[PDB]
Structures are given as structure tokens and as C-alpha cells.
Amino acid sequence: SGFRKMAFPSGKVEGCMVQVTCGTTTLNGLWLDDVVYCPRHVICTSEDMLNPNYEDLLIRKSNHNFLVQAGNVQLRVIGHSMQNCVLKLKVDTANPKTPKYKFVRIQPGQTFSVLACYNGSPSGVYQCAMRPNFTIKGSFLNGSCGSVGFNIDYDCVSFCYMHHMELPTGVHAGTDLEGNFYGPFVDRQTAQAAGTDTTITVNVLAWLYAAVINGDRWFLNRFTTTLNDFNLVAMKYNYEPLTQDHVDILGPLSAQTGIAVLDMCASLKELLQNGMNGRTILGSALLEDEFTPFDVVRQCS
Amino acid sequence: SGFRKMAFPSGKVEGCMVQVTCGTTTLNGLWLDDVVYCPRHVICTSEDMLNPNYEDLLIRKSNHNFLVQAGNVQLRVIGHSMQNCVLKLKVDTANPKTPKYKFVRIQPGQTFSVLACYNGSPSGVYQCAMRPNFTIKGSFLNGSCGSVGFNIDYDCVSFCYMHHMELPTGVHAGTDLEGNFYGPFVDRQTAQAAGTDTTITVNVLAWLYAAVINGDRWFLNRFTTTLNDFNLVAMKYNYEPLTQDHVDILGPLSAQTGIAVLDMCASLKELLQNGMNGRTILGSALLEDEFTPFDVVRQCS
Ligand SMILES: *[C@](O)(C(N)=O)[C@H](CC1CCC1)NC(=O)[C@@H]1[C@@H]2[C@H](CN1C(=O)[C@@H](NC(=O)NC(C)(C)C)C(C)(C)C)C2(C)C
Numbered sequence: 263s264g265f266r267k268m269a270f271p272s273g274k275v276e277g278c279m280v281q282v283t284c285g286t287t288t289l290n291g292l293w294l295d296d297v298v299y300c301p302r303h304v305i306c307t308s309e310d311m312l313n314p315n316y317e318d319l320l321i322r323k324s325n326h327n328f329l330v331q332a333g334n335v336q337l338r339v340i341g342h343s344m345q346n347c348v349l350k351l352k353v354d355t356a357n358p359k360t361p362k363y364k365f366v367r368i369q370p371g372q373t374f375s376v377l378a379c380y381n382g383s384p385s386g387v388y389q390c391a392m393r394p395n396f397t398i399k400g401s402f403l404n405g406s407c408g409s410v411g412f413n414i415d416y417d418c419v420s421f422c423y424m425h426h427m428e429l430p431t432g433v434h435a436g437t438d439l440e441g442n443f444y445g446p447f448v449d450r451q452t453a454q455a456a457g458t459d460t461t462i463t464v465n466v467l468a469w470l471y472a473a474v475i476n477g478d479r480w481f482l483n484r485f486t487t488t489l490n491d492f493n494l495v496a497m498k499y500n501y502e503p504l505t506q507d508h509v510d511i512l513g514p515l516s517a518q519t520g521i522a523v524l525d526m527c528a529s530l531k532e533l534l535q536n537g538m539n540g541r542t543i544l545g546s547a548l549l550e551d552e553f554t555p556f557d558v559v560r561q562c563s
Numbered sequence: 564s565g566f567r568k569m570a571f572p573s574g575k576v577e578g579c580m581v582q583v584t585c586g587t588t589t590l591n592g593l594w595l596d597d598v599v600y601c602p603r604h605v606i607c608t609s610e611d612m613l614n615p616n617y618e619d620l621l622i623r624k625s626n627h628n629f630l631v632q633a634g635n636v637q638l639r640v641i642g643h644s645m646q647n648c649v650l651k652l653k654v655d656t657a658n659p660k661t662p663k664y665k666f667v668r669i670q671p672g673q674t675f676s677v678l679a680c681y682n683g684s685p686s687g688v689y690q691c692a693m694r695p696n697f698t699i700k701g702s703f704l705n706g707s708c709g710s711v712g713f714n715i716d717y718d719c720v721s722f723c724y725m726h727h728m729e730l731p732t733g734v735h736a737g738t739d740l741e742g743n744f745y746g747p748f749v750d751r752q753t754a755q756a757a758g759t760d761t762t763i764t765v766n767v768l769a770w771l772y773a774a775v776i777n778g779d780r781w782f783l784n785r786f787t788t789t790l791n792d793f794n795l796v797a798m799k800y801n802y803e804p805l806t807q808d809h810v811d812i813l814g815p816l817s818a819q820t821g822i823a824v825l826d827m828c829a830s831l832k833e834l835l836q837n838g839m840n841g842r843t844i845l846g847s848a849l850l851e852d853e854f855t856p857f858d859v860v861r862q863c864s
């Protein structure tokens with residue numbers, strides 16, 4: 263019983279966090295086998311970041327320009343390369359705490375846990391969703407760059423995010439672990455517009471199913487809608503369109519609760535048109551959209 | 564920038580979680596040095612739990628009645644004792660992953676991270692507050708008993724909660740790590756009334772300071788109140804009284820933001836009397852009360 267924003271246990275990732283220093287710039291790195299991954303702008307001075315040519319900046323760097331600290335132990339860099347927006351520092355020692363892992367590039371609307379780190383030391387863990395506009399609403403201060411986002415499936419850590427930058431609205435942007443940014447952003451200190459964000463409709467529906475599983479039921483009704491009629495209301499309230507693939511994904515939850523997906527859409531439509539009128543769902547006065555259907559099944563086990 | 568419900572990194576606790584089986588009952592245990600701590604009702608059958616005499620039930624148990632599994636390895640119990648509502652199983656092996664640790668009994672309104680576990684395997688981590696009525700609003704399913712709550716300060720894990728039971732409202736109750744329940748509850752399957760809960764006033768104020776630190780400022784005003792006048796409004800809205808000790812604790816946050824504690828009380832009073840009128844604070848449409856002043860200082864670092 264109960265429903266919380268639940269992150270994955272962070273131990274397997276904690277053992278991979280290191281500190282990377284280049285000149286006067288210090289941030290976090292991810293130590294897997296004998297490679298340390300970190301944002302490539304660790305090689306930049308502040309005046310470099312305004313319009314950097316990373317090829318030129320890196321060609322002027324040597325292995326001894328990179329100071330990597332794994333706790334108390336300093337790791338010797340024996341090689342460096344650049345992949346997209348990440349820097350790969352080959353080190354002399356294989357991380358003995360390397361878990362079974364993969365790199366994955368996630369789709370918008372998917373969730374992951376973030377291990378916030380500073381100077382290579384983990385500070386906290388929390389859940390985030392990749393927004394439809396490919397930003398994330400994290401909690402990041404100066405020094406958090408290189409912190410990673412991840413999911414776990416049995417004994418495998420799927421890394422999906424590395425933190426690079428903060429947007430003027432206080433939201434955050436970064437890359438997959440192969441250095442490709444999510445969204446249209448670039449690692450250059452220049453005006454960059456984030457797209458207008460939207461609400462992740464399939465996640466709101468999954469969260470409504472979690473509420474029913476936990477006994478929150480006041481929002482249900484006997485009406486129904488068509489998938490096409492629901493999407494016309496969703497468009498008005500800046501919700502993402504619901505597809506039949508979304509309906510199929512919500513299959514197991516609909517079967518467990520006995521509430522057809524299109525029936526739950528009718529209840530969501532009324533919540534959008536009427537509001538909640540002083541009531542709450544799972545302790546929230548807002549419609550919550552950073553729980554995936556998998557997140558609900560996992561926690562409501 | 565940003566503000567999230569942030570749990571402590573869970574790695575140090577993950578290495579302590581084991582599985583304890585007694586007959587047909589299986590739950591989680593905490594393995595520290597050569598002792599395994601778990602809820603004492605692991606020795607109960609379902610008909611025992613309706614009105615158990617734990618002294619009689621335990622006197623009929625032997626060491627070989629306790630099956631402890633640490634991952635793949637089975638731990639041999641060489642001794643057992645009962646402390647309040649916890650069972651202490653002495654094992655033949657000292658846990659090599661034992662962190663620096665303490666047992667602490669927390670005050671209501673304090674927060675902690677929970678590592679939800681099933682069959683000795685960590686499932687997720689989230690933040691909880693000890694409610695004024697000494698329940699917690701966790702996320703616990705069958706098999707989660709023995710999961711622990713904790714805080715971390717540098718390299719020391721302060722354990723403060725072990726999970727025992729679910730209340731009919733879906734809220735949760737448990738003990739400190741020395742077996743003393745929080746609140747009036749007992750580990751017996753009998754009607755037990757939880758006290759009427761209240762809102763943790765000092766935490767709401769801390770969260771309002773976090774909002775100002777992050778640029779959420781619409782709720783401020785130029786009014787002020789007296790501590791006595793504020794507490795009269797707090798009593799009407801089922802908020803806990805604010806003490807001068809609470810005011811002193813909010814000192815560092817008030818100094819960082821330049822907003823006097825009693826000035827923030829005036830803004831909270833207006834939020835209570837008027838509502839938020841379709842606005843949000845730190846992404847919430849409700850006044851949030853499970854962030855302590857320490858939680859804010861830690862995350863808004
Ligand atoms: C990390 O590298 C770190 N050391 O933790 C750092 C985190 C930020 C939080 C303040 C310091 N990231 C950057 O410094 C990042 C590097 C330059 C500029 N960066 C920013 O995050 C800037 N944002 C920004 O200019 N955003 C746009 C370009 C306007 C959209 C800050 C103004 C927040 C510093 C680069 C390469 C993007």
C-alpha cells in the first residue's frame with residue numbers, strides 16, 4: 263500500500279563515480295572497466311565555453327592534463343578520446359566495482375533515477391522523467407555535471423543520461439552515455455530555446471491506475487470516450503496524443519483493475535475539464551505524469 | 564537549481580540486507596557485524612499474530628529454526644535474543660560490508676530514506692517523514708517487513724526505522740532499531756487507532772525558503788505576524804504550533820534569503836487563508852511538509 267516516487271537502489275552506480283579535473287574545471291566522471299566517461303567541456307575555460315572548438319581545445323591537451331580521483335586513489339590516464347559530447351579517458355586500472363551494464367538512449371516520457379554527485383561523491387538519488395521537450399526537471403548545482411541517470415533490470419545498470427547544463431528556466435539538459443544530447447541542445451554557452459513542453463498522457467493514465475490499485479477511486483465515472491474524442495480534449499489541455507500503442511501498453515494495468523483504457527480516458531477528460539475541486543489523488547493535487555506504466559507495475563507489485 | 568524529494572545514496576545499506584525465514588514466514592533482516600536484526604513477528608504463524616505471547620513463541624524456537632540468506636550464501640545462526648519488538652540473530656560471520664553506523668530514535672517531523680526490500684533484495688529508495696502521529700506514508704507491500712529507514716552523515720549510516728505493519732488507512736508503522744515502536748502501536752493483529760495527524764509547520768516554512776532560493780517568490784508579501792498570532796491560524800488549519808526553537812532552526816535559511824521567519828509565517832498564513840488559486844510552488848499544488856530545514860540546506864547547497 264502507498265505510492266511513492268521511487269528511485270532504483272544506487273549502490274551499483276555509487277561504485278562507479280569518480281572525480282575528473284582538467285585545469286581549474288572539476289566535475290564528475292563515470293568509471294566503467296578501464297574507461298572514465300565525463301562531459302567534454304571539462305577541457306574548457308570559462309571563455310572557451312562561450313564558443314568552443316572542442317577539436318582544437320582537445321588537440322592541445324595531454325593525458326597528464328587530466329586528473330582522475332577515485333575516492334582517495336588517483337587514477338593514471340593513459341589515453342583520451344572524444345565521442346560526440348563525452349570525453350573517454352582510458353585509465354591504467356579496471357574498476358573492480360564495474361556492474362553488469364549497458365548504455366541506452368531513452369525515449370521521451372521514460373523515467374530514470376539520477377545519482378546527484380559532487381567532486382565524485384554521491385549526494386542523493388531521485389526519480390526524473392525525460393520530458394517531451396527533452397529536458398529534465400532535476401536538482402543540480404554547480405559541480406553536478408557528469409552525474410548519471412540510470413535504470414536497473416535484475417543485475418544490469420542501463421545508463422541513459424549524463425548531466426551537462428542548466429537552462430534559464432532552471433531545467434536541465436544532457437546526453438546519453440555515448441555523448442549525444444537529448445533534444446536540440448549543444449554544449450556551447452549560447453542562447454538555446456527549449457521547445458514548449460507537454461504533459462505525458464500515457465503516464466498520467468498509468469498513475470490513475472496506480473491510484474485505483476491503492477483505493478483512490480473518486481475520479482472514476484461510467485462514461486467512456488473514443489480514442490479520437492479523447493485526443494481532441496488532450497490537444498486543448500497541452501497533453502500528448504494517446505496512440506493505440508499507448509492503449510496496448512496500458513493493457514496489464516487495465517486488466518488488473520477491470521477499468522478499460524478508454525474508460526480511464528473518460529475520467530481523465532473530466533478531471534481536465536472540471537479540475538479536482540479540492541481533492542487529491544495519491545497525495546497530489548496535480549495530475550502526475552512522471553510514472554510510466556512499468557513504474558506502476560513495479561511499485562504496485 | 565530545481566528541488567526534488569531526494570533520498571540518500573543507498574549503497575551502504577544495500578550491503579546489509581538479508582533474508583530471514585522462520586517456518587512459512589519470510590521477511591527482511593539487517594546484517595550488521597555478526598547480528599541480524601528483524602521484526603520479532605517472523606516467529607509467528609498467522610493465528611499467532613492475532614494475540615501473540617512472544618516470550619512463549621520464542622522459547623519454543625531454536626537456532627536451526629531461523630534460516631538467514633545473504634544473497635546466495637546461507638548464514639548459520641549461532642544465537643538468538645529478543646529486544647523489545649526486534650529479533651537479534653547472532654550469526655557465525657561478520658558482515659564484511661558493515662558501514663560505520665549508529666542506531667537513532669528520531670523525533671516526529673524528521674525525515675529519512677527508506678530502502679524497500681523483498682526477500683532480502685533491495686527494490687527501491689524514497690524519502691519519508693515521521694508524521695506527528697508517528698505513522699509514515701511509505702510504499703510497502705507484503706514481504707517488505709524488515710526494510711529500514713536511515714540517514715547518512717559523512718560516512719555514517721544512522722538507522723532510525725524498521726518496518727513492521729500496515730494500518731487500515733494504508734499508512735505504515737514500525738520501530739527504531741532497538742525494537743521500540745514509534746507511536747502507540749503494538750505488533751499484534753488487533754484494532755489500533757492512529758492519532759489525528761497534523762501538518763509539520765516548520766517543514767512547510769523550510770520548503771517555502773527552498774522555493775525562494777530557487778526563484779519561486781509569488782507567495783511573499785510585505786505583511787508580518789507575531790509568533791502568537793500565527794499559531795492561532797495554524798491551530799485552525801490543523802498545523803502544528805511553531806515554537807521559538809523552530810524559529811531559531813530556520814535561522815540560516817532566513818539569513819540566506821533575507822526573509823525574516825515571522826515574515827515567511829505571514830506568507831504561509833495568507834496561503835492557508837486564500838489557497839494558491841491555480842498556482843504552484845516547486846511543482847506542487849499543495850503545501851509540502853516532509854522537507855526539514857536540514858533537507859533544504861543539504862539540497863539547495
Ligand atoms: C557543469 O559542467 C559542472 N561543473 O557542474 C556545469 C553545471 C553548471 C550549473 C552552474 C554550473 N555546466 C556548465 O557549466 C555548462 C557548460 C557551459 C555553460 N553551462 C551551463 O550550464 C550554463 N548554462 C547555459 O549557458 N545555458 C544555455 C546555453 C543558455 C542554454 C550556466 C549559465 C548554468 C553556467 C556548457 C558547455 C553548456
Ligand SMILES: *[C@](O)(C(N)=O)[C@H](CC1CCC1)NC(=O)[C@@H]1[C@@H]2[C@H](CN1C(=O)[C@@H](NC(=O)NC(C)(C)C)C(C)(C)C)C2(C)C
Nearest residue numbers: 590604612704705706707708727728729750751752753755
Ligand atoms: C510483514 O511482516 C511482511 N512479511 O512483509 C507484514 C507486512 C504486511 C503487508 C501485508 C503483510 N506485516 C504483518 O503481517 C503485520 C504483523 C501482524 C499483522 N500485520 C499487518 O501488517 C496487518 N495490519 C494490521 O492488522 N494492522 C492493525 C493491527 C489493524 C493496525 C495486515 C492486515 C496488513 C496484514 C503484525 C504482528 C502486526
